[PDB]
Write a protein that binds this ligand. Sequence first.
Ligand SMILES: *[C@@H]1O[C@H](CO)[C@@H](O[C@@H]2O[C@H](CO)[C@@H](O[C@@H]3O[C@H](CO)[C@@H](O)[C@H](O)[C@@H]3O)[C@H](O)[C@H]2NC(C)=O)[C@H](O)[C@H]1NC(C)=O
Ligand SMILES: *[C@@H]1O[C@H](CO)[C@@H](O[C@@H]2O[C@H](CO)[C@@H](O[C@@H]3O[C@H](CO)[C@@H](O)[C@H](O)[C@@H]3O)[C@H](O)[C@H]2NC(C)=O)[C@H](O)[C@H]1NC(C)=O
Ligand SMILES: *[C@@H]1O[C@H](CO)[C@@H](O[C@@H]2O[C@H](CO)[C@@H](O[C@@H]3O[C@H](CO)[C@@H](O)[C@H](O)[C@@H]3O)[C@H](O)[C@H]2NC(C)=O)[C@H](O)[C@H]1NC(C)=O
Ligand SMILES: *[C@@H]1O[C@H](CO)[C@@H](O[C@@H]2O[C@H](CO)[C@@H](O)[C@H](O)[C@H]2NC(C)=O)[C@H](O)[C@H]1NC(C)=O
Ligand SMILES: *[C@@H]1O[C@H](CO)[C@@H](O[C@@H]2O[C@H](CO)[C@@H](O)[C@H](O)[C@H]2NC(C)=O)[C@H](O)[C@H]1NC(C)=O
Ligand SMILES: *[C@@H]1O[C@H](CO)[C@@H](O[C@@H]2O[C@H](CO)[C@@H](O)[C@H](O)[C@H]2NC(C)=O)[C@H](O)[C@H]1NC(C)=O
Ligand code: NAG
Ligand code: NAG
Ligand code: NAG
Ligand code: NAG
Lengths: 319, 319, 318, 172, 184, 176
Amino acid sequence: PGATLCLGHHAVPNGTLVKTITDDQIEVTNATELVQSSSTGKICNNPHRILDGIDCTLIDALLGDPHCDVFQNETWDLFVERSKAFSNCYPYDVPDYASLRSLVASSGTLEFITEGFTWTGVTQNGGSNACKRGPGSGFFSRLNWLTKSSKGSTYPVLNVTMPNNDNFDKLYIWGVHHPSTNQEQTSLYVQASGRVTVSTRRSQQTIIPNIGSRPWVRGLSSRISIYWTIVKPGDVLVINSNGNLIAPRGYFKMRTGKSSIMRSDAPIDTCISECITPNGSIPNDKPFQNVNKITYGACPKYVKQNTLKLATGMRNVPE
Amino acid sequence: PGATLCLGHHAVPNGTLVKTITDDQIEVTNATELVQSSSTGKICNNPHRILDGIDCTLIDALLGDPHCDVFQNETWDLFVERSKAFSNCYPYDVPDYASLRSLVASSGTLEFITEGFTWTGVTQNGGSNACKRGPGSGFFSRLNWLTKSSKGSTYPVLNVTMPNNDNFDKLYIWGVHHPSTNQEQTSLYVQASGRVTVSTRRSQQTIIPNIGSRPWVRGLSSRISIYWTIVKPGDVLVINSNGNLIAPRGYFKMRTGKSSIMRSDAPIDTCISECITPNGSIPNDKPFQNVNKITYGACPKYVKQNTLKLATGMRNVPE
Amino acid sequence: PGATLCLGHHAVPNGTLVKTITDDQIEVTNATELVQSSSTGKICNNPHRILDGIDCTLIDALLGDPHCDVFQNETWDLFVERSKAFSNCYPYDVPDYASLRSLVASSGTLEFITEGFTWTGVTQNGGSNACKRGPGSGFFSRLNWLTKSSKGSTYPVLNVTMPNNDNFDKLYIWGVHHPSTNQEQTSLYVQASGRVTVSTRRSQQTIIPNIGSRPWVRGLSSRISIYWTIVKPGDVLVINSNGNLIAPRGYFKMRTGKSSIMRSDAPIDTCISECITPNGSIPNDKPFQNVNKITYGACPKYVKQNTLKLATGMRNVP
Amino acid sequence: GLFGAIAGFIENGWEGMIDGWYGFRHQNSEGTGQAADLKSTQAAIDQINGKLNRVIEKNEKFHQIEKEFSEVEGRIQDLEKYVEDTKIDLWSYNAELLVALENQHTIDLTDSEMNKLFEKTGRQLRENAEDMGNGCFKIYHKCDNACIESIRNGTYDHDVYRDEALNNRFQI
Amino acid sequence: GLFGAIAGFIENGWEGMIDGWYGFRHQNSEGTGQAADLKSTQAAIDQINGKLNRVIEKTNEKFHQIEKEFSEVEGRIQDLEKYVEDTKIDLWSYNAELLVALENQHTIDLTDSEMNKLFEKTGRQLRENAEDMGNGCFKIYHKCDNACIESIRNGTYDHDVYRDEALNNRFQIKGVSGGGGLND
Amino acid sequence: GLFGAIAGFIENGWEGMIDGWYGFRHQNSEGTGQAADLKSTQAAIDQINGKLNRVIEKTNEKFHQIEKEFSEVEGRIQDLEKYVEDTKIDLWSYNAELLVALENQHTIDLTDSEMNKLFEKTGRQLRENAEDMGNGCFKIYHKCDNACIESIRNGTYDHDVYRDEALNNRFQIKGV
Ligand SMILES: *[C@@H]1O[C@H](CO)[C@@H](O[C@@H]2O[C@H](CO)[C@@H](O[C@@H]3O[C@H](CO)[C@@H](O)[C@H](O)[C@@H]3O)[C@H](O)[C@H]2NC(C)=O)[C@H](O)[C@H]1NC(C)=O
Ligand SMILES: *[C@@H]1O[C@H](CO)[C@@H](O[C@@H]2O[C@H](CO)[C@@H](O[C@@H]3O[C@H](CO)[C@@H](O)[C@H](O)[C@@H]3O)[C@H](O)[C@H]2NC(C)=O)[C@H](O)[C@H]1NC(C)=O
Ligand SMILES: *[C@@H]1O[C@H](CO)[C@@H](O[C@@H]2O[C@H](CO)[C@@H](O[C@@H]3O[C@H](CO)[C@@H](O)[C@H](O)[C@@H]3O)[C@H](O)[C@H]2NC(C)=O)[C@H](O)[C@H]1NC(C)=O
Ligand SMILES: *[C@@H]1O[C@H](CO)[C@@H](O[C@@H]2O[C@H](CO)[C@@H](O)[C@H](O)[C@H]2NC(C)=O)[C@H](O)[C@H]1NC(C)=O
Ligand SMILES: *[C@@H]1O[C@H](CO)[C@@H](O[C@@H]2O[C@H](CO)[C@@H](O)[C@H](O)[C@H]2NC(C)=O)[C@H](O)[C@H]1NC(C)=O
Ligand SMILES: *[C@@H]1O[C@H](CO)[C@@H](O[C@@H]2O[C@H](CO)[C@@H](O)[C@H](O)[C@H]2NC(C)=O)[C@H](O)[C@H]1NC(C)=O
Ligand SMILES: *[C@@H]1O[C@H](CO)[C@@H](O)[C@H](O)[C@H]1NC(C)=O
Ligand SMILES: *[C@@H]1O[C@H](CO)[C@@H](O)[C@H](O)[C@H]1NC(C)=O
Ligand SMILES: *[C@@H]1O[C@H](CO)[C@@H](O)[C@H](O)[C@H]1NC(C)=O
Ligand SMILES: *[C@@H]1O[C@H](CO)[C@@H](O)[C@H](O)[C@H]1NC(C)=O
């Protein structure tokens, strides 16, 4: 007449396999997934300020391609560039494009302040049928195509100065015009050879135009090259040219902050999500993810494994 | 009247010291080495396709330096450059040589397609005695040295186009000639200073030649400067020169894949190894190696340790 | 009739909290701190050779700004650049400035050996009011400003050469002068347009001077751009130019070693310390530090945590 | 398991125990029963949960380097790709090693909590019980339900039964 | 703790114990006393030290490196420099945090383990002369003056000397006619 | 070890034990014998192979990469290329150092554990018929012949069969 007291532990009908130091697969009562491997497919518009570029690139929105005028003075946490974006103004290039795109994306703003530049002796507001505005020819909104004076056929040595008496850095975007024939060079600027020199107290850039043919884009073999100059407070911008200057109209304000840019063809949706990938938002309740190595926000760290199981119960040993 | 039962574990005559969290050295019965520290000294020709440069650099083989002619239309997984390699053609330089070397190495092929460029008004197939093809004067096989017409004073503005109507990327190599004196400049090209503008639809380069002496090499004070342009499908090449143009004769086919290039002075051998180092192939059964940080293939990871002992038996206790 | 024996462990009144794998905070008897989070605010003058730039950047010392003359031939383990440094010579820039500064900092020396360049047919040794030397006009100690010949009013193609028959690498610092007006360009150099080609057997740089108005910097709108050429043993320098050449006077010896450069406003004082940060020397007895990601020498590794306690005793149960 | 209780001298687990991770099943005069030990259960669950909270604890990054490229560029693009690929491999390694280490330690601490309860029980029982070697105690005296309960909440006074038990153990 | 002795069946530590990490309190015919046990105390200390010296071994020496602070905006190349350095600090912050959490988990368990090892040793040495009271104390069933206690602390205790006296006190059953032996 | 049996209450290892990692020695009325235990020897071995097979498993294919040696001083970009590769090597070097140290610690501890488990397993078989002598040995208080030693080794041993005999020997008691 005695008693038995048994010591035991629970089990479940079917548990889950996990990895260990010693075993590839061993069954436990229960695990949990540490790798996020799915996205909703859509980019959530909160809590970050998302700006969809749609047909426009950031550089085109910056320069002021007419089909991008909607983007004047825009600001963003995340700028979204779509693959379908296209240019529709004067054919151009930016030497070191990726850096200009980077530093503007990182500044988070396209706030423009027009300034009162004075262009003595030259015709202003040059346009082109490669860039059409309203009923006629046109040009980039933030740039100013200067050509010879209307009567006299004369193009002076341009010499403007512009001081920075604010407490912020100004970004100037300017450019050089490369014509396709000498005839075009001299009819526009008189001088057989042009020259653009932009300098501050800290720096100087002189660019010499190049005459000749590039492939036909929207009617032109000509080209414009884009350059930029940052002018710190207490400093001064001097522009010196005797031909081919695509002059600035003002400065872009520069800021620092969490702003960036992403390339994605994910639709934008009204939802809350801290983490954005090219594919849409993904939740961040796990530490790792397999969705994209490109992320913006408070995001799981990207790993190569599409699953990692974290045992959260004892070893499961069925009956 | 009774008995004794003794429990116990094995020991061996001589055990191995290993490191632990708690002990710098402790004797266990057995361990295994995790760091590969030796090489046979030879590069195995399998399973990766190995091309031995021998006297040739990749860039010299790409350009068509005559003693490298044996490498025309060649392909590789790994190109091996010897330090005994040497140039034997026109003295040249490549601005960002490292990038041209990398993009070609990574493409894995010197497949070249000639195209029927028309150079109206100039003498083609120029040659020098610094670049002998057999006993007589010659040039890089893939470049085409254009000079003034065999009429006294003519070098026109060369202006040619070549469209990419294929479904792959085309790599064009071209060049600018830098004469050593002014007499030389006008005697080859008529014009006092030349120009070369090569461009596509979204990019351009113009190179202005510089007249002057450089150190004497193979009889020459002159230089050629090598440049490249990748043309995507749908895009179109434009070449625009009024002198000093070292022209392409066609394009190289571009590819993507596992291809690379490595500097080694190690003999090739008939055997198999997945992992290659400048020192030859090394086995990849260990997870780490101390041989070289430069590897190719399926390799143990480079670590600064020459030995790492992984205990594969119990602690060793002999008395 | 009997006894009782009680096994036990020790405890302290109030111990330290530490992190573990399963507990965020659990109390142990002793812990040790693994992150160095503070500095005295001084840079120890030992054991490294610290060279205080004071008023001078490394580059102004390289070029030879007159107030930097005291740095001629200096050597350093670490060059320290200060907030109040200033240039006081000809206004200049350096394309790829970060690289020249990097490679000179890492070489650890300003040993300069002047060489006998012959500049036939031009005037040497020009100076500016922008770079005064006593009450006179002056120029960077290491550069030779050349102009049209004194009485001929001619500037020839200069074509000089200089071989490296030594067993070390030679570093040449040279320049190109950018005038403000065409009157200045032709007045100095005769040719309406200059040119400077500096080359070795396998490499070359050719530069075209830029003419134009620029804001004044020390009374001038004109500029110099600085360039460099390394010449290995067996190779040859060749300099070719028909105007606007700021000539090298010779070479810098080049070395390899542990040398580097650091920006800092910390003073230097007596103590011994293997690890330097911009904020002062720090001890390296801990494995990690939170003072500055910039360091020099035998240093704890930089982590984001300002504290990490390593338990050095058993759980505390009072 | 390091401790040899789970998947060890305990041969299997109890699917019927759906209110604890550990517990007691008994047999006596009055029949058979079952209860969870809430303390050892809570100790296990507390340790799993802390381990979980530490891991799933929320980095934040914004403007970064580009990681996909639409054009061949060479040296600088090479490096950018290498930087990211090196990064991903290092975190991938961390992730992997982390779960393997953690899982190993989960199994062992739950094995540990099982062993500790079996031993706590054995110490209570003193000379009145014997360990059958499979996680059962043979109790050598009359233990009704309130007696079994007293063991399970740790108030079992062993002196009360020592006489009876001792004489049953040392028998023939 | 894995082994269940510190914060386990040992209810709490001794603040009076100031010359050892582990030890013995007792009670006998001559009263109470306390003594640290040197072997188990040193075993813990040697392991912690071994660990401490692994972690604080100076390995890291670097001289010229990349720039980590910038005074102007440059784009691509500066982005990558910042990226590189930000990526490294994160990896090293992670190693750092993982190391001390893992180490501390282990320091606690190996010190719990030492306590447990000392307790089982003492038990094994006593044999049938004592019983585990379940709280870290053995009840010793014979007369054990101070010399005797010391023999258990220094490991010389001969159980055979006392087995007869012990067993005799230990298994007395009230209900049977067997209390103590009265044969001489 | 955390479990106190190897380099612990077992004084040392048996070099003559060459057919297993763990096992038994005995003396009875019929002389002495030695036999290795299979389950614990395999349990230890299987665990170590599991982790050795994890560690040495091939997981690294890289093809085109950055340059890692240079023949000219260049400045900024080459500084970054060297810093990146050196950062990497240092992190993998740490990983490898830590890996081996953690593993070697566990290896020593699981083998200590397997030894302790076999001992406890054998203690529980014997019930009240034997006593833990404190050095990894059991004094068995009845007559146990080779068939009997073998029944303890193969796990069928029946303690009730020997209990009355052993109990009577364990508790025999001398007067003064
Ligand atoms: C240098 O050579 C190029 C190519 O031969 C010349 O560019 C060519 O100019 C003609 C007219 O400007 C372009 O023609 C047209 O084709 C488009 C469709 O592609 C059509 O929409 C137009 O109505 C017209 O028929 C031609 O496309 C353009 N070629 C290219 C490839 O850009 C160039 O004119 C020559 N340079 C000079 C200054 O002569
Ligand atoms: C500018 O100066 C350079 C160097 O002072 C001149 O280059 C020199 O021209 C001579 C004549 O061809 C070269 O000479 C020869 O030496 C080689 C061995 O190196 C030998 O094989 C030949 O038979 C001949 O004797 C000389 O090497 C070359 N020097 C250099 C450094 O490049 C150059 O001619 C001057 N330029 C002008 C246009 O005046
Ligand atoms: C192009 O425009 C710029 C800006 O106006 C002109 O630069 C200016 O030249 C004047 C006289 O050469 C400089 O003036 C003076 O101010 C200083 C104090 O700052 C004083 O010490 C002098 O006595 C004098 O009053 C002015 O600073 C300078 N501006 C800049 C930005 O450098 C330039 O002359 C024009 N270029 C041409 C070719 O006309
Ligand atoms: C997230 O989006 C990316 C691209 O938008 C997807 O990745 C591509 O996946 C295919 C499938 O292997 C690859 O062949 C491409 O090379 C990928 N791009 C890159 C750069 O890796 C990815 O599959 C998406 N994720 C989900 C879950 O839909
Ligand atoms: C693999 O080859 C390399 C380079 O050829 C050898 O490494 C050189 O080793 C010496 C001394 O070991 C150092 O002085 C050089 O600095 C090394 N080069 C570098 C940059 O590390 C190496 O020892 C060879 N390894 C084997 C296993 O043979
Ligand atoms: C070491 O010096 C750096 C100076 O750069 C100090 O860090 C700055 O700290 C403030 C606030 O703590 C930040 O707002 C700045 O962004 C920091 N600068 C950088 C570049 O990180 C730091 O506090 C000093 N630390 C010690 C311990 O002295
Ligand atoms: C942008 O904002 C500024 C802020 O005052 C203002 O000057 C300017 O008018 C705005 N831009 C446009 C597109 O009008
Ligand atoms: C499985 O474990 C997770 C975390 O431990 C927990 O959220 C969940 O409730 C468990 N599931 C079951 C079946 O209890
Ligand atoms: C040593 O260990 C390795 C891996 O555990 C094994 O291959 C080898 O057989 C062992 N050697 C001996 C002496 O058994
Ligand atoms: C600078 O160092 C060089 C090195 O030999 C020497 O010729 C010269 O005279 C030095 N001048 C100094 C020490 O200022």
